[PDB]
Coordinates of C-alpha atoms and ligand atoms in Angstrom, one line a residue:
Chain A
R1 CA 14.7 -23.8 4.9
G2 CA 10.5 -24.3 5.3
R3 CA 8.2 -22.0 7.1
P4 CA 5.9 -23.8 9.7
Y5 CA 3.6 -20.8 10.3
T6 CA 0.5 -19.5 8.4
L7 CA -0.6 -16.2 8.1
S8 CA -4.3 -15.3 7.3
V9 CA -5.7 -12.0 6.7
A10 CA -9.8 -11.0 7.2
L11 CA -11.7 -7.8 5.8
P12 CA -15.1 -7.3 5.0
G13 CA -16.6 -7.5 1.5
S14 CA -18.3 -4.3 1.9
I15 CA -15.5 -2.0 1.0
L16 CA -16.2 -2.9 -2.7
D17 CA -19.4 -1.0 -2.0
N18 CA -17.2 2.3 -1.4
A19 CA -15.5 2.2 -4.7
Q20 CA -16.7 4.7 -6.9
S21 CA -16.9 2.7 -10.2
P22 CA -16.8 -0.4 -11.6
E23 CA -13.4 -0.3 -12.9
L24 CA -12.7 0.7 -9.6
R25 CA -14.3 -1.8 -7.7
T26 CA -12.3 -4.6 -10.0
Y27 CA -9.1 -2.5 -9.2
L28 CA -9.6 -2.7 -5.5
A29 CA -10.4 -6.5 -5.4
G30 CA -6.7 -6.5 -7.2
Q31 CA -5.0 -4.2 -4.6
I32 CA -6.3 -6.4 -1.9
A33 CA -5.0 -9.9 -3.6
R34 CA -1.5 -8.1 -4.4
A35 CA -1.0 -6.9 -0.9
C36 CA -1.9 -10.1 0.6
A37 CA 0.5 -11.8 -2.2
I38 CA 3.4 -9.8 -1.6
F39 CA 3.4 -10.7 2.4
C40 CA 3.0 -14.4 1.7
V41 CA -0.7 -14.6 3.0
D42 CA -1.6 -18.2 3.1
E43 CA -5.6 -17.5 3.7
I44 CA -8.0 -14.7 3.0
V45 CA -11.2 -14.4 4.6
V46 CA -13.9 -12.2 3.6
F47 CA -16.5 -11.7 6.0
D48 CA -20.1 -10.1 6.1
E49 CA -20.0 -7.1 8.3
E50 CA -24.0 -6.5 7.8
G51 CA -23.8 -10.7 0.2
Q52 CA -22.9 -9.5 -3.3
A53 CA -19.7 -7.5 -2.3
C54 CA -18.4 -10.3 -0.6
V55 CA -19.1 -12.8 -3.4
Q56 CA -17.4 -10.4 -6.0
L57 CA -14.7 -9.7 -3.9
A58 CA -13.8 -13.5 -3.2
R59 CA -14.0 -14.6 -6.8
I60 CA -11.7 -12.0 -7.8
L61 CA -9.2 -13.2 -5.2
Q62 CA -9.6 -16.5 -6.1
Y63 CA -9.2 -15.8 -10.0
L64 CA -6.1 -14.0 -9.3
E65 CA -4.9 -16.8 -7.6
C66 CA -5.2 -19.4 -9.8
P67 CA -2.0 -20.2 -11.9
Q68 CA -2.8 -18.6 -15.7
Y69 CA -2.3 -22.1 -17.4
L70 CA -5.5 -23.6 -15.1
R71 CA -7.8 -20.6 -15.1
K72 CA -10.2 -21.7 -18.1
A73 CA -10.3 -25.0 -16.5
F74 CA -11.8 -23.3 -13.1
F75 CA -13.1 -20.3 -14.1
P76 CA -15.7 -19.7 -17.2
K77 CA -14.0 -16.2 -16.7
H78 CA -13.6 -13.0 -19.1
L79 CA -12.4 -11.6 -14.5
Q80 CA -9.5 -11.1 -17.3
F81 CA -9.8 -7.6 -16.7
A82 CA -9.1 -7.9 -13.1
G83 CA -6.0 -10.2 -14.2
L84 CA -4.5 -7.6 -16.3
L85 CA -4.7 -4.8 -13.7
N86 CA -3.3 -6.6 -10.6
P87 CA -1.3 -9.6 -11.7
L88 CA 0.0 -11.9 -8.3
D89 CA 3.1 -12.8 -10.4
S90 CA 3.7 -15.6 -7.3
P91 CA 6.1 -18.4 -7.4
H92 CA 3.2 -20.9 -8.7
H93 CA 3.1 -18.5 -11.0
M94 CA 5.8 -19.8 -13.4
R95 CA 6.2 -19.9 -17.1
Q96 CA 6.6 -22.9 -19.1
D97 CA 10.1 -22.5 -19.9
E98 CA 11.0 -22.0 -16.0
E99 CA 12.5 -24.9 -13.8
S100 CA 10.5 -25.4 -10.4
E101 CA 10.6 -28.1 -8.1
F102 CA 7.0 -28.0 -7.6
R103 CA 4.0 -27.3 -10.2
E104 CA 0.2 -26.7 -9.6
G105 CA -2.0 -28.7 -11.8
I106 CA -5.6 -30.0 -13.0
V107 CA -6.1 -33.8 -12.9
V108 CA -7.2 -34.1 -16.7
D109 CA -10.3 -36.2 -18.0
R110 CA -8.4 -39.1 -19.5
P111 CA -10.0 -42.7 -20.1
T112 CA -7.5 -44.8 -17.7
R113 CA -7.7 -48.2 -16.4
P114 CA -7.7 -48.5 -12.8
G115 CA -4.9 -48.7 -10.8
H116 CA -2.5 -47.1 -13.4
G117 CA -2.4 -43.2 -12.1
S118 CA -3.4 -40.3 -13.2
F119 CA -2.5 -37.6 -15.8
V120 CA -1.9 -33.7 -15.0
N121 CA -1.5 -30.6 -16.9
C122 CA 0.8 -28.8 -14.7
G123 CA 1.0 -26.3 -17.9
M124 CA 4.4 -28.2 -19.2
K125 CA 5.2 -28.8 -22.5
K126 CA 4.0 -32.7 -21.6
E127 CA 1.7 -33.9 -19.2
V128 CA 2.9 -35.1 -15.6
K129 CA 2.5 -38.9 -15.1
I130 CA 1.6 -39.7 -11.2
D131 CA 0.9 -42.8 -9.5
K132 CA -2.2 -41.9 -7.8
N133 CA -5.5 -42.6 -9.5
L134 CA -7.5 -39.3 -9.0
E135 CA -10.7 -37.9 -10.6
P136 CA -10.5 -35.5 -13.3
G137 CA -11.0 -31.7 -12.3
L138 CA -9.0 -31.9 -9.2
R139 CA -6.4 -29.0 -8.5
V140 CA -3.2 -30.9 -7.3
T141 CA 0.2 -30.0 -6.2
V142 CA 2.6 -32.0 -7.7
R143 CA 6.8 -32.3 -7.3
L144 CA 8.5 -33.3 -10.0
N145 CA 10.8 -36.0 -10.3
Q146 CA 14.6 -34.8 -10.2
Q147 CA 15.3 -37.8 -12.8
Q148 CA 13.5 -37.6 -16.3
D149 CA 12.6 -38.6 -24.2
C150 CA 9.4 -39.8 -22.8
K151 CA 5.8 -39.2 -23.6
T152 CA 5.5 -37.7 -19.9
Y153 CA 7.1 -36.0 -17.3
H154 CA 7.0 -38.0 -13.9
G155 CA 5.9 -36.6 -10.4
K156 CA 4.0 -37.0 -7.2
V157 CA 1.2 -35.4 -5.5
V158 CA 1.9 -33.9 -2.5
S159 CA 0.3 -32.0 0.3
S160 CA -0.7 -28.4 -0.9
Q161 CA 1.5 -27.3 2.2
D162 CA 4.6 -28.7 1.1
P163 CA 6.1 -25.9 -0.8
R164 CA 5.9 -23.9 2.2
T165 CA 6.4 -26.1 5.0
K166 CA 9.6 -28.0 2.9
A167 CA 10.8 -25.6 0.9
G168 CA 10.0 -22.0 2.3
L169 CA 8.0 -21.1 -0.8
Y170 CA 5.2 -18.9 -1.2
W171 CA 2.5 -20.9 -2.8
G172 CA -0.6 -18.8 -2.9
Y173 CA -3.4 -18.4 -0.8
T174 CA -7.2 -20.1 -0.1
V175 CA -10.0 -17.8 0.2
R176 CA -12.7 -18.4 2.5
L177 CA -16.4 -16.9 2.9
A178 CA -17.5 -16.1 6.5
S179 CA -20.9 -15.1 7.1
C180 CA -20.3 -12.7 10.1
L181 CA -17.3 -11.6 12.6
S182 CA -17.6 -14.6 14.9
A183 CA -17.5 -17.0 11.7
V184 CA -13.8 -15.5 11.1
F185 CA -12.7 -16.9 14.0
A186 CA -14.9 -20.3 14.3
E187 CA -14.6 -21.6 10.9
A188 CA -10.8 -21.7 10.4
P189 CA -9.5 -24.2 8.5
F190 CA -7.0 -25.3 11.3
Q191 CA -8.3 -27.8 13.9
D192 CA -6.5 -25.9 16.7
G193 CA -7.8 -22.5 15.3
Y194 CA -5.8 -19.3 15.1
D195 CA -3.8 -19.4 18.1
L196 CA -2.6 -15.5 17.7
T197 CA -5.4 -13.1 16.4
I198 CA -4.4 -9.6 15.7
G199 CA -7.1 -6.8 15.2
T200 CA -6.2 -3.4 13.5
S201 CA -7.7 -0.2 14.3
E202 CA -6.3 3.7 14.8
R203 CA -7.8 3.1 18.3
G204 CA -5.4 0.0 19.0
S205 CA -2.4 0.0 21.2
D206 CA 1.1 1.3 19.9
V207 CA 1.9 -1.8 17.2
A208 CA 5.9 -1.0 18.0
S209 CA 5.7 -1.6 22.1
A210 CA 3.7 -5.1 21.2
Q211 CA 5.8 -8.5 21.7
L212 CA 4.1 -11.1 19.5
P213 CA 3.8 -14.6 21.2
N214 CA 5.2 -17.8 19.6
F215 CA 2.6 -19.1 17.1
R216 CA 1.4 -21.4 14.4
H217 CA -1.7 -19.7 13.0
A218 CA -1.8 -16.1 12.8
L219 CA -5.0 -14.1 11.8
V220 CA -4.7 -10.4 11.2
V221 CA -8.2 -8.7 11.0
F222 CA -9.2 -5.5 9.3
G223 CA -12.3 -3.3 9.4
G224 CA -14.2 -1.7 6.2
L225 CA -15.3 2.1 6.5
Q226 CA -17.0 2.0 9.9
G227 CA -14.1 0.0 11.4
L228 CA -14.2 -3.6 13.3
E229 CA -17.0 -2.0 15.4
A230 CA -19.6 -2.6 12.5
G231 CA -18.9 -6.5 12.3
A232 CA -18.7 -6.9 16.1
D233 CA -21.9 -5.2 16.8
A234 CA -23.7 -6.8 14.1
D235 CA -23.0 -10.2 15.1
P236 CA -25.0 -11.8 18.1
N237 CA -22.3 -14.7 18.7
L238 CA -20.0 -12.0 20.0
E239 CA -19.4 -10.0 23.2
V240 CA -21.0 -6.6 22.8
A241 CA -18.1 -4.1 23.5
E242 CA -15.7 -2.4 21.7
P243 CA -13.8 -4.5 19.6
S244 CA -10.2 -5.2 21.4
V245 CA -11.7 -8.0 23.4
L246 CA -12.2 -10.2 20.4
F247 CA -8.5 -10.1 19.9
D248 CA -5.2 -11.4 21.4
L249 CA -3.9 -8.0 20.0
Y250 CA -5.5 -4.9 18.9
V251 CA -3.1 -2.6 17.5
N252 CA -2.7 1.1 15.6
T253 CA 0.1 0.3 13.2
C254 CA 0.6 3.7 11.5
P255 CA 1.3 6.0 14.7
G256 CA 0.9 9.5 14.1
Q257 CA -1.2 9.3 11.1
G258 CA -1.1 12.2 8.9
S259 CA -4.4 11.6 7.1
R260 CA -7.8 11.3 9.1
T261 CA -8.5 7.7 7.9
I262 CA -6.5 5.0 6.2
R263 CA -8.6 3.1 3.8
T264 CA -8.7 -0.7 4.1
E265 CA -6.5 -1.6 1.5
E266 CA -3.9 0.9 2.4
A267 CA -4.3 -0.5 6.1
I268 CA -3.2 -4.1 5.1
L269 CA 0.0 -2.9 3.4
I270 CA 1.1 -1.0 6.1
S271 CA 0.0 -3.4 8.8
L272 CA 1.6 -6.5 7.4
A273 CA 4.8 -4.4 6.8
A274 CA 4.7 -3.2 10.3
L275 CA 4.1 -6.7 11.8
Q276 CA 6.5 -8.6 9.3
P277 CA 9.5 -8.6 11.6
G278 CA 7.6 -9.6 14.6
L279 CA 5.5 -12.4 12.7
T280 CA 8.6 -13.8 11.1
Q281 CA 10.5 -14.4 14.8
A282 CA 7.7 -15.6 16.6
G283 CA 6.6 -17.7 13.9
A284 CA 10.1 -19.5 13.6
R285 CA 10.7 -22.9 14.6
Chain B
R1 CA 6.4 18.8 21.0
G2 CA 7.6 20.1 17.5
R3 CA 9.3 17.7 14.9
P4 CA 12.4 19.0 14.2
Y5 CA 12.9 16.7 11.0
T6 CA 11.8 16.7 7.5
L7 CA 10.7 13.7 5.1
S8 CA 10.9 13.8 1.4
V9 CA 9.9 11.4 -0.9
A10 CA 11.2 11.0 -4.6
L11 CA 9.7 8.8 -7.4
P12 CA 9.4 9.1 -11.2
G13 CA 6.5 10.5 -13.1
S14 CA 6.7 7.7 -15.7
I15 CA 4.7 5.5 -13.4
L16 CA 1.4 7.3 -14.7
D17 CA 2.3 5.4 -18.2
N18 CA 2.0 2.1 -16.3
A19 CA -1.8 2.8 -15.6
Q20 CA -4.2 0.9 -17.9
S21 CA -6.9 3.8 -18.4
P22 CA -7.2 7.5 -18.0
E23 CA -9.3 7.0 -14.7
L24 CA -6.8 4.8 -13.5
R25 CA -3.8 7.2 -14.1
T26 CA -5.9 9.9 -12.0
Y27 CA -6.4 7.4 -9.0
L28 CA -2.9 6.1 -9.0
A29 CA -1.7 9.7 -8.7
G30 CA -4.3 10.0 -6.0
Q31 CA -2.6 6.7 -4.1
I32 CA 1.1 8.5 -4.1
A33 CA -0.5 11.8 -2.7
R34 CA -2.3 9.5 0.0
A35 CA 0.9 7.4 1.0
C36 CA 2.7 10.4 1.7
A37 CA -0.1 12.3 3.6
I38 CA -0.4 9.2 5.8
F39 CA 3.5 9.2 6.6
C40 CA 3.4 12.8 7.3
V41 CA 5.7 13.5 4.0
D42 CA 6.9 17.0 3.9
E43 CA 7.9 17.0 0.3
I44 CA 7.2 14.8 -2.7
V45 CA 9.8 15.3 -5.6
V46 CA 8.7 14.3 -8.8
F47 CA 12.0 13.2 -11.2
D48 CA 12.2 12.7 -14.7
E49 CA 13.7 9.1 -15.3
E50 CA 14.3 9.5 -18.9
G51 CA 16.4 12.4 -17.9
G52 CA 7.6 15.4 -19.5
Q53 CA 3.5 15.2 -19.7
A54 CA 3.7 12.2 -16.6
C55 CA 5.5 14.2 -14.6
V56 CA 3.6 17.1 -14.9
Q57 CA 0.1 15.5 -14.6
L58 CA 1.3 13.7 -11.5
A59 CA 2.7 16.7 -9.9
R60 CA -0.5 18.7 -10.6
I61 CA -2.7 16.2 -9.0
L62 CA -0.7 16.1 -6.0
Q63 CA -0.5 19.7 -5.7
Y64 CA -4.6 19.7 -5.8
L65 CA -4.9 17.3 -3.3
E66 CA -2.6 19.1 -1.1
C67 CA -4.2 22.4 -1.4
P68 CA -7.3 22.9 1.2
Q69 CA -10.7 22.6 -0.2
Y70 CA -11.5 26.4 0.5
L71 CA -8.3 27.6 -1.4
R72 CA -8.6 25.4 -4.3
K73 CA -11.0 27.8 -6.6
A74 CA -8.5 30.4 -6.0
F75 CA -5.2 28.4 -7.0
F76 CA -6.4 25.7 -9.3
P77 CA -8.4 26.8 -12.8
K78 CA -10.0 23.9 -14.5
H79 CA -7.8 21.6 -16.3
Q80 CA -7.4 18.4 -18.4
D81 CA -5.2 16.7 -15.9
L82 CA -7.6 17.3 -12.9
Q83 CA -10.8 16.1 -15.1
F84 CA -11.0 12.7 -13.2
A85 CA -10.2 14.4 -9.7
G86 CA -13.7 12.9 -8.3
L87 CA -12.1 9.7 -8.3
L88 CA -9.6 10.9 -6.0
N89 CA -9.2 10.1 -2.6
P90 CA -9.2 13.4 -0.3
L91 CA -6.2 13.6 1.9
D92 CA -8.1 14.6 5.3
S93 CA -4.7 16.0 6.5
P94 CA -4.8 18.5 9.7
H95 CA -4.8 21.5 7.6
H96 CA -7.8 20.5 5.9
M97 CA -10.3 21.3 8.3
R98 CA -14.0 22.4 8.2
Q99 CA -15.1 26.0 8.8
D100 CA -16.5 25.2 12.4
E101 CA -13.2 23.6 13.4
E102 CA -10.9 25.3 16.2
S103 CA -7.4 25.3 15.0
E104 CA -4.3 26.7 16.1
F105 CA -3.2 27.5 12.5
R106 CA -4.8 27.9 9.4
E107 CA -3.8 28.2 5.7
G108 CA -5.1 31.4 3.6
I109 CA -4.8 33.3 0.8
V110 CA -4.3 37.0 0.9
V111 CA -7.3 38.8 -0.5
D112 CA -7.5 42.1 -2.4
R113 CA -9.4 44.6 0.5
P114 CA -9.2 48.1 1.1
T115 CA -5.6 48.9 3.2
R116 CA -2.6 51.3 3.7
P117 CA 0.9 50.9 4.1
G118 CA 1.5 49.9 7.5
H119 CA -2.4 48.7 8.3
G120 CA -1.7 45.0 7.3
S121 CA -3.7 42.7 5.3
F122 CA -6.7 40.5 4.9
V123 CA -6.5 36.9 4.5
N124 CA -9.3 34.4 3.4
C125 CA -8.8 31.6 6.0
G126 CA -11.8 29.6 5.2
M127 CA -13.4 30.8 8.3
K128 CA -16.7 32.7 8.8
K129 CA -14.9 36.2 8.2
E130 CA -11.6 37.1 6.6
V131 CA -8.7 37.3 9.0
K132 CA -6.9 40.5 9.7
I133 CA -3.3 40.3 10.0
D134 CA -0.4 43.1 10.5
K135 CA 1.7 42.2 7.8
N136 CA 1.3 44.1 4.3
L137 CA 1.5 41.3 1.6
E138 CA 0.3 41.3 -2.0
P139 CA -3.1 39.8 -2.8
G140 CA -2.7 36.1 -4.0
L141 CA -0.1 34.8 -1.7
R142 CA -0.7 31.5 0.2
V143 CA 0.4 31.8 3.8
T144 CA 0.2 30.2 7.2
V145 CA -1.4 32.0 9.6
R146 CA -1.5 31.4 13.5
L147 CA -4.6 32.6 15.1
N148 CA -4.7 35.0 18.1
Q149 CA -5.4 32.8 20.8
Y150 CA -10.7 37.3 13.8
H151 CA -7.2 38.4 14.1
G152 CA -3.9 36.5 13.6
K153 CA -0.4 36.5 12.5
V154 CA 1.5 35.2 9.4
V155 CA 4.1 32.9 10.5
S156 CA 6.5 30.3 8.9
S157 CA 4.6 27.3 7.0
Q158 CA 6.9 25.2 9.0
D159 CA 5.6 26.2 12.6
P160 CA 2.8 24.0 12.6
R161 CA 5.2 21.1 12.3
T162 CA 8.5 22.5 14.2
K163 CA 6.5 24.0 17.0
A164 CA 3.1 22.1 17.3
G165 CA 4.0 18.8 15.8
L166 CA 0.9 19.1 13.2
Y167 CA 1.6 17.6 9.9
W168 CA 0.9 20.3 7.5
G169 CA 1.1 19.1 4.1
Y170 CA 3.8 18.5 1.4
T171 CA 5.4 20.7 -1.4
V172 CA 5.8 19.1 -4.6
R173 CA 9.3 19.6 -6.5
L174 CA 9.8 18.5 -10.1
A175 CA 13.2 17.5 -11.0
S176 CA 14.6 17.0 -14.5
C177 CA 16.6 13.8 -13.7
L178 CA 17.7 11.7 -10.7
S179 CA 20.8 13.8 -9.9
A180 CA 18.4 17.0 -9.6
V181 CA 16.5 15.2 -6.7
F182 CA 19.9 15.5 -4.6
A183 CA 21.1 18.5 -6.2
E184 CA 18.1 20.8 -5.9
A185 CA 16.9 19.7 -2.5
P186 CA 15.2 23.0 -0.9
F187 CA 17.2 22.8 2.1
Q188 CA 21.1 24.6 2.5
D189 CA 22.7 21.3 3.5
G190 CA 20.8 19.3 1.2
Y191 CA 19.3 16.0 2.5
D192 CA 21.9 14.7 5.2
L193 CA 20.0 11.2 5.1
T194 CA 19.3 9.7 1.8
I195 CA 17.6 6.2 1.2
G196 CA 17.1 4.3 -1.7
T197 CA 14.7 1.6 -2.3
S198 CA 15.3 -1.8 -4.2
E199 CA 14.7 -5.6 -4.2
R200 CA 18.5 -5.7 -4.6
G201 CA 19.1 -3.5 -1.6
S202 CA 20.3 -4.8 1.9
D203 CA 17.6 -6.0 4.2
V204 CA 15.9 -3.3 6.0
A205 CA 16.1 -5.2 9.5
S206 CA 19.7 -4.6 9.8
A207 CA 19.7 -0.6 8.4
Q208 CA 21.0 1.9 11.3
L209 CA 19.9 5.1 10.6
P210 CA 22.0 8.1 11.8
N211 CA 21.0 10.9 13.5
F212 CA 19.2 13.1 10.7
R213 CA 17.7 16.6 10.1
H214 CA 16.4 16.0 6.3
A215 CA 15.4 12.7 5.2
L216 CA 14.9 11.4 1.6
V217 CA 13.5 8.3 0.6
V218 CA 14.0 7.3 -3.1
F219 CA 11.9 5.1 -5.2
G220 CA 12.0 3.9 -8.8
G221 CA 9.3 3.6 -11.5
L222 CA 8.8 0.1 -13.5
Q223 CA 12.7 -0.4 -14.6
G224 CA 14.3 0.7 -10.9
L225 CA 16.2 3.2 -10.2
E226 CA 18.6 1.8 -12.6
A227 CA 16.7 3.7 -15.3
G228 CA 16.9 7.3 -14.1
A229 CA 20.7 6.4 -13.3
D230 CA 21.5 5.3 -16.4
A231 CA 19.4 8.0 -18.0
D232 CA 21.3 10.9 -16.2
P233 CA 24.1 11.9 -18.1
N234 CA 25.6 13.7 -14.8
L235 CA 25.7 10.5 -13.0
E236 CA 28.4 7.7 -14.4
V237 CA 27.6 4.9 -11.5
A238 CA 27.7 1.1 -11.9
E239 CA 24.5 0.7 -10.0
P240 CA 22.1 2.9 -7.8
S241 CA 23.3 2.0 -4.5
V242 CA 26.4 4.3 -4.5
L243 CA 24.3 7.3 -4.7
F244 CA 22.4 6.7 -1.3
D245 CA 23.6 6.5 2.3
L246 CA 21.5 3.3 2.8
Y247 CA 20.1 1.0 -0.2
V248 CA 17.3 -1.1 1.2
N249 CA 14.9 -3.9 0.5
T250 CA 12.1 -3.3 2.8
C251 CA 9.9 -6.3 2.2
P252 CA 12.1 -9.7 2.6
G253 CA 10.9 -12.8 0.9
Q254 CA 8.0 -10.7 -1.3
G255 CA 5.8 -13.1 -2.5
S256 CA 5.2 -11.4 -5.6
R257 CA 7.9 -10.7 -8.1
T258 CA 7.4 -7.1 -8.4
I259 CA 6.0 -4.7 -5.9
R260 CA 4.6 -1.5 -7.7
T261 CA 6.0 2.1 -6.9
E262 CA 2.7 2.8 -5.2
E263 CA 2.9 -0.5 -3.1
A264 CA 6.3 0.0 -2.1
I265 CA 6.2 3.9 -0.8
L266 CA 3.3 2.5 2.1
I267 CA 5.5 -0.7 2.7
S268 CA 8.7 1.1 2.9
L269 CA 7.4 4.1 4.8
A270 CA 5.8 1.7 7.4
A271 CA 9.2 -0.3 7.5
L272 CA 11.4 2.6 8.0
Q273 CA 8.8 4.6 10.4
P274 CA 10.3 3.4 13.5
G275 CA 13.9 4.1 12.4
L276 CA 12.9 7.8 10.7
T277 CA 11.0 8.8 14.3
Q278 CA 14.0 7.4 16.4
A279 CA 17.0 9.1 14.4
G280 CA 15.1 12.2 13.7
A281 CA 13.8 13.1 16.9
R282 CA 15.7 16.3 18.9
Ligands
SAH1 N1 -3.9 3.5 12.6 C1 -4.1 2.5 11.8 N2 -3.9 1.1 12.0 C2 -4.2 0.1 12.2 N3 -5.4 -0.5 11.4 C3 -6.0 0.8 11.0 C4 -5.5 1.9 11.2 N4 -6.2 3.2 10.1 C5 -7.3 2.3 9.8 N5 -6.8 1.1 10.0 C6 -7.4 -0.5 9.4 O1 -8.4 0.1 8.2 C7 -9.7 -0.2 8.5 C8 -10.4 0.9 7.8 S1 -10.7 2.5 8.4 C9 -11.9 2.7 9.6 C10 -12.4 3.9 9.9 C11 -13.4 3.8 11.2 N6 -13.8 5.4 11.5 C12 -12.9 3.3 12.5 O2 -13.5 3.8 13.5 O3 -12.1 2.6 12.5 C13 -10.2 -0.3 10.1 O4 -11.0 -1.2 10.1 C14 -8.6 -1.0 10.5 O5 -8.6 -2.3 10.1
SAH2 N1 11.6 -5.6 -2.1 C1 11.6 -4.1 -2.3 N2 12.1 -3.3 -1.5 C2 12.1 -1.8 -1.5 N3 11.6 -0.9 -2.5 C3 10.8 -1.9 -3.5 C4 11.0 -3.2 -3.5 N4 10.3 -3.9 -4.4 C5 9.8 -2.9 -5.5 N5 10.4 -1.3 -4.7 C6 10.4 0.0 -5.2 O1 9.4 -0.2 -6.2 C7 10.0 0.4 -7.4 C8 9.4 -0.4 -8.4 S1 9.6 -1.9 -9.1 C9 11.1 -1.9 -9.7 C10 11.4 -3.4 -10.4 C11 12.6 -3.5 -11.1 N6 12.4 -4.8 -12.1 C12 13.6 -3.5 -10.3 O2 14.6 -4.4 -11.0 O3 14.1 -2.8 -9.4 C13 11.7 0.1 -7.2 O4 12.3 1.0 -8.1 C14 11.7 0.3 -5.5 O5 12.0 1.8 -5.3

């Protein structure tokens, strides 16, 4: 039932600068968030391929990922427009009425006696009581007890990776800022790093011909208006050459494209669709 | 060399009504045009899923974007539906070339220049000079011209594709209902492969596409293909799958509750691309 692999996507913040209005800038950020949610992307890495655009993108991505009942707690907000344009509707974004094995919550600032556990706002009709003693303001994943007229529901804090790794549920993404293209690779949140890296380009090899190797943590990387060339050339930590040398695979995911250029946000949907069968097979236990 | 098959996409004009501003409405139309151009779609069918304004606005934006830039003044007077065209992303298709670019074919408009029966016509093909052709044609007609390898020959508009393998844009068709998508196909034998899309469809990974000549991929709007099927008095079906050769979910295990039509076109045409390419080949 569980999914043992992760999928990360990297792209440059600069793509917001190419948007033609403030409204379209915000919509574009939403397009990115939605593409990643649709394809059950676990991490979005926003890199500086050269600042403002990177930070604005990352913040919108985080806001959209956050369950609605937690947003006012984590975001000074009103971002509200971005959320209206492109809601994720992901499995952790359930309504108060819906039954769920897991829920995201925030530990509430309640005066408690040491050792007596904590109270969590999981967006339910009642607070959830947990045995772990945690600081108010932390975001946690709670597994609700199967057996529950008490003042609270009861649950236990579990790893935020449990819904995916144990139940096969998509549970949103984390957003990482990277100061350059080398940092996309170097500052992976996995000890082992990304063991399968895939770059994308019209100059890549045919995606249809590639055999994806078995993997645990995949990374798919996208460029902006000037391709992965911009990021590669700007970073002194990286080999000076065409970008294909920086990846395990470097693929064209739309053979015979009928437009001269495919935009980053279009390419993420096309590429993740093209790679989905392969990633599913190669990532399986 | 040539590509012997066509690919048509159908969707409801009603999706423009779900856009949250006038500017986003125009932007969304452009998203449809670009998704179709990227995938070398030859025809976009805009249908009325209620069984008029959204459909006409979508159709007009699609046609405007398809038209080579040097012919837009001739074919597109200023209109309210195109007031936000500046926010559109150009298609940058093969027939959208600059004046300096060498090309085997160019689109043109026959122009009013002195001629006599039998002495042919002149065509504005966007080149430095108007192009002389041997065929007598009325001014104002759009034609495909094969340049002599400033003289050319008017050829079938399907030659760039069928002979040279070039994507050459799309035609736009309005359909008054879902059944008309099928019934008013511009091909004599109709669409011989029809593919509907839905989260309730069978897994696209198991689909086996039969050899085909004219493929059709159909998308619903906010309420799915159920809406158009239900609203059309020419159909009396329980659910939409029986209208199609294949009825497919193209994004297994999707991580959002709903995939919007414009997202789904990109995902589904990507998912089907290997299959379509293989099954349509000579
Ligand atoms: N055919 C294709 N296959 C895979 N990815 C593509 C693609 N076309 C565009 N992309 C993705 O979309 C991004 C923006 S398009 C970049 C265009 C640039 N002229 C260049 O030389 O690459 C690219 O960096 C790549 O990540
Ligand atoms: N998983 C999926 N596979 C294929 N097409 C999909 C899809 N999800 C959405 N679509 C396409 O996008 C359109 C808009 S989404 C429609 C959702 C509607 N609640 C319904 O019951 O269908 C659909 O009509 C379909 O053409």
